[PDB]
Amino acid sequence: TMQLIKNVQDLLILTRSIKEKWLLNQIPDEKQIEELLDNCIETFVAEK
Amino acid sequence: MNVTPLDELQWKSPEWIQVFGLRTENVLDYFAESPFFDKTSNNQVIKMQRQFSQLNPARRQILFKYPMYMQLEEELMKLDGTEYVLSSVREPDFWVIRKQRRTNNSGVGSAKGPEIIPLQDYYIIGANIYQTIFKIVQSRLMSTSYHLNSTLESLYDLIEFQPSQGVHY
């Protein structure tokens, strides 16, 4: 009983450790913005 | 049919000790009515012979101390077989007999006397009688193992496991 249970539990822990290693260890326009800011600043100037 | 082992069998005879009392003189007389005293032993035959005649280290110490013990040899040397003889005595409460069987091998070529072979152990403690240590040891060990099994199964029931920690309580 003790040996079977211990061996199976050890194997399961080993599998989880492998999966954890798998997850962790594996290392891997501008012009439109111009008129956008121009309209924003002129709108604020008018509204201020 | 369930039989209590004779090794643990203990006889008490309050009437006999009340009437006669405990003494080395009648210790064999006390033993006579017990179940352990076989009726086929030559001691009983000697007893009926005496009755019919009337109608018509410490071993050497107890050897030389009593004359009835002498008469026991000179009446027992003639009859070979299962016989009851005293082992040792310390007064006024402790007596033990020696349970041996005799085969008087008078054949040619044997310079030794009659062969004496043990058969059983008997201890007279007070008014009580007691009659293998291997069995005692194995019984104690097996009961210990049973208790250990109970404790370990209870402890394993108490055990709780989680993958992220191991086993805890």
From Swiss-Prot, chain A:
Subcellular location(s) per record: Nucleus
Family statement: Belongs to the Mediator complex subunit 22 family.
Subunit structure comment from the entry: Component of the Mediator complex, which is composed of at least 21 subunits that form three structurally distinct submodules. The Mediator head module contains MED6, MED8, MED11, SRB4/MED17, SRB5/MED18, ROX3/MED19, SRB2/MED20 and SRB6/MED22, the middle module contains MED1, MED4, NUT1/MED5, MED7, CSE2/MED9, NUT2/MED10, SRB7/MED21 and SOH1/MED31, and the tail module contains MED2, PGD1/MED3, RGR1/MED14, GAL11/MED15 and SIN4/MED16. The head and the middle modules interact directly with RNA polymerase II, whereas the elongated tail module interacts with gene-specific regulatory proteins.
Note from the entry: Present with 2181 molecules/cell in log phase SD medium.
Function: Component of the Mediator complex, a coactivator involved in the regulated transcription of nearly all RNA polymerase II-dependent genes. Mediator functions as a bridge to convey information from gene-specific regulatory proteins to the basal RNA polymerase II transcription machinery. The Mediator complex, having a compact conformation in its free form, is recruited to promoters by direct interactions with regulatory proteins and serves for the assembly of a functional preinitiation complex with RNA polymerase II and the general transcription factors.
Protein name: Mediator of RNA polymerase II transcription subunit 22
Organism of provenance: Saccharomyces cerevisiae (strain ATCC 204508 / S288c) (Baker's yeast)
Species lineage: Eukaryota, Fungi, Dikarya, Ascomycota, Saccharomycotina
Chain's gene name: SRB6
Whole sequence portion shown: 62 to 119 of 121
UniProtKB/Swiss-Prot annotation, chain B:
Subcellular location: Nucleus
Record has Chloroplast as a keyword: no
Keyword Transcription regulation in record: yes
Ranges in a coiled coil: none
GO biological process: positive regulation of transcription by RNA polymerase II; positive regulation of transcription elongation by RNA polymerase II; positive regulation of transcription initiation by RNA polymerase II; regulation of transcription by RNA polymerase II; RNA polymerase II preinitiation complex assembly
This protein's UniProt keywords: Activator, Nucleus, Phosphoprotein, Transcription, Transcription regulation
A single Gene Ontology CC term: mediator complex
GO MF entries: transcription coactivator activity
Extra remark: Present with 4824 molecules/cell in log phase SD medium.
Subunit relationships: Component of the Mediator complex, which is composed of at least 21 subunits that form three structurally distinct submodules. The Mediator head module contains MED6, MED8, MED11, SRB4/MED17, SRB5/MED18, ROX3/MED19, SRB2/MED20 and SRB6/MED22, the middle module contains MED1, MED4, NUT1/MED5, MED7, CSE2/MED9, NUT2/MED10, SRB7/MED21 and SOH1/MED31, and the tail module contains MED2, PGD1/MED3, RGR1/MED14, GAL11/MED15 and SIN4/MED16. The head and the middle modules interact directly with RNA polymerase II, whereas the elongated tail module interacts with gene-specific regulatory proteins.
Family: Belongs to the Mediator complex subunit 6 family.
Task of the protein: Component of the Mediator complex, a coactivator involved in the regulated transcription of nearly all RNA polymerase II-dependent genes. Mediator functions as a bridge to convey information from gene-specific regulatory proteins to the basal RNA polymerase II transcription machinery. The Mediator complex, having a compact conformation in its free form, is recruited to promoters by direct interactions with regulatory proteins and serves for the assembly of a functional preinitiation complex with RNA polymerase II and the general transcription factors.
Protein name as annotated: Mediator of RNA polymerase II transcription subunit 6
Organism per entry: Saccharomyces cerevisiae (strain ATCC 204508 / S288c)
Name of the gene this protein is made from: MED6
Residues of the full protein shown: 1 to 202 of 295
